[PDB]
Structure 1
């Protein structure tokens, strides 16, 4: 109860910043998460013993893939921590509880393959879940782990408060399906622009949390350039393995997934920043002004990929 988590001084200061990198010491990542829950939510949000047992079971259910791994989970939770801490008064008690957990769980048991590859392979998960296939699975794995003995971190919530937090987590995880992001951001853009956006309207809040989930999920493009650049190598190592598997099924993959077309990576990142990332952080900054450093960092990284193309690196 009187037992804080404290971080060394450099991590204590830099963890508050949006561009923080959680580091290569895997054994410190649980401590970093608990630290963030404690300042974001409170030392009373969760029973320490249950929360530590939940974190360790979540870790165990992330696989040893190049990108969609335990480090990605904790990275996405840290971006959500930074958003919540820079927007103190905008979020409910239940939302603070649910959103860091949703972020830690959002890619549980990822195999390093897209929804499209599962559907072409005819994976059983593609018959169980016809849209947002991996995302319905991540939510299903989250509920499985919450139901293990001694793992119910929400045990103190009422029946209806429990149902609300699980519903925040479900919508937050479904929203990480990038297919859904384009339409969500268009609606939010129109709502903001015609001044109909209303944070007392639950369906509006839902959309705003959706966009926060996309922003946290893509936060690799908001880091210092050497982090951004080295993370892109992991991102492509997955896509290229999926491309290899597409070629094994007798299907030319898209160029993004074809290792034979490595050379167009710089131009592929430009389209990504222009079509996905910059629009995401722009609309997020319009709705939540203190998230502007994510947009500024994204713009700085777009300019670095421009320099790669001009052969200045």
Structure 2
């Protein structure tokens, strides 16, 4: 197609030029083409392209297939969300020096998981066990796109490497289920508090990869004020939109969190979210690698901003 040809023939700027290494990155002013280019640069600079012999044309087709399976009409959970979640992964890996800690297969899987973790989201969200139903669909959608002809970027992996990487991908995507985060963090935080966290440990690695997946998933809560505010409105819009649709299809009144009225509470809500969900995660990630401090730092600054508003409100 015309779009595939343009992407495959375009020049991919450097990571430094695309500024995808900084945790303060923002996609707002980038076109759809520029994001895909950034995506390519990510697979490139993590050495996934050559270490796994990826055919440039196939990588481009896959990236387009993944971006396609996201619905733009969905306020927040769309391609830009997936792209940013992946960009945070890259930054954490590079700027956050998390790369030397993982294997190429783990990295390969994480990048892929990051890009496809919310595939075909329909704007139906939760509150806080639901058995990761939503996440399961996101994986099927991911698996499918990896099997579709000319989209098989995992060709070149031995049978075992494929079976391995697939498991890691499945787990990373499902990990993005907040219910699972709430379930597993307790153990993670305790290992970090007792200064006995060990990545050399299979299970503690699986736990780390899960925690890392969630940190990137929520990266927006750590971004610079302009950006955070801008994305919180996408999030708010999705929720309110859901409350309306739900009161329509069903006869159920929206929770304050999801009904348009009572929007004056987003500041108050934002503080609670950060306190109960984000902060601990980013403070813990910083314990695993101080180079991730930027995330924790920005999460904090965001709380100050939201706290002020919640009162001044």
TM-score of the superposition, structure 1-length normalised? 0.90
Partner of 2:125: 114
Question: Residue 205 of structure 2 aligns with which residue?
Answer: 205
Match of 1:124 in 2: none
Q: What is the aligned partner in structure 2 of residue 19 from structure 1? A: 24
Match of 2:44 among 38, 48, 52: 38
TM alignment of 1:46-61, pairs within 5 A? 46-61=54-69
Instruction: For residue 24 of structure 2, give the secondary structure of its aligned residue in structure 1.
Output: coil
8 Å contact from structure 2 (residues 176, 210) kept in 1: yes
Deviation at 1:115, TM superposition (A): 5.2
Bigger drift between 142-151 and 19-28 goes to: 19-28
- Verify: 1:28 aligned to 2:34, yes or no: yes
Q: 1:132 & 1:102 partners in 2: Cα distance?
A: 15
What does residue range 160-199 of structure 1 map to in structure 2 within 5 Å?
Answer: 160-199=160-199
- SS of residue paired to 2:262: helix
2:109 corresponds to which residue? 98
Secondary structure of 1:295's aligned partner: helix
Structure 1 residue runs without a partner (length 5+): 120-129
Aligned residues: 296
**Cα distance between partner residues in 1 of 2:296 and 2:192:** 17
Q: Residue 68 in 1 paired to residue 58 in 2?
A: no
- Indicate conservation of the 8 Å contact 2:265/2:310, yes or no: no
Whole-angstrom CA distance in 2 between matches of 1:47 and 1:149: 13
1:41 shift after superposition: 2.7
Cα distance, 1:8–1:132 mapped onto 2, change above 3 Å:
closer
Q: Is the 8 A contact 2:243 2:254 kept in 1?
A: yes
Q: Using the alignment, how far apart are the partners of 1:55 and 1:208 within structure 2?
A: 26
- Among 84, 103, 113, the alignment partner of 2:93 is 84
Q: How much does 1:87 deviate?
A: 2.1
Q: How many Å apart are 1:260 and its aligned residue?
A: 1.4
Partner of 1:241: 241
Contact residue 41 and residue 97 of structure 1 kept, 8 A:
no
Conserved in 2, the CA contact under 8 Å of 1:115 and 1:133?
Answer: no
Q: What is the CA–CA distance in structure 1 between the aligned matches of 2:12 and 2:33, rounded to whole Å? A: 14
Report the Cα offset of residue 247 of structure 1.
1.8
TM-score, scaled relative to structure 2: 0.90
How far apart are 1:101 and its partner, in Å? 0.8
Q: CA RMSD in A?
A: 1.9
What is the CA–CA distance in structure 2 between the aligned matches of 1:115 and 1:282, rounded to whole Å? Answer: 25
Q: 2:13 aligns to what?
A: 6
- 1:158-202 CA-to-partner distances (Å, cap 9, x unmatched) read 111101111111000001011111121111011222344221222
Mark the CA change 1:8 to 1:203 in structure 2 (over 3 Å): closer, same or farther: closer
What's the secondary structure of 1:168's corresponding residue?
helix
Alignment match, 1:260: 261
Counterpart CA distance in 1 for 2:47 and 2:123 is 31
Give yes or no for contact 2:15–2:38 (8 Å, CA) kept in 1. no
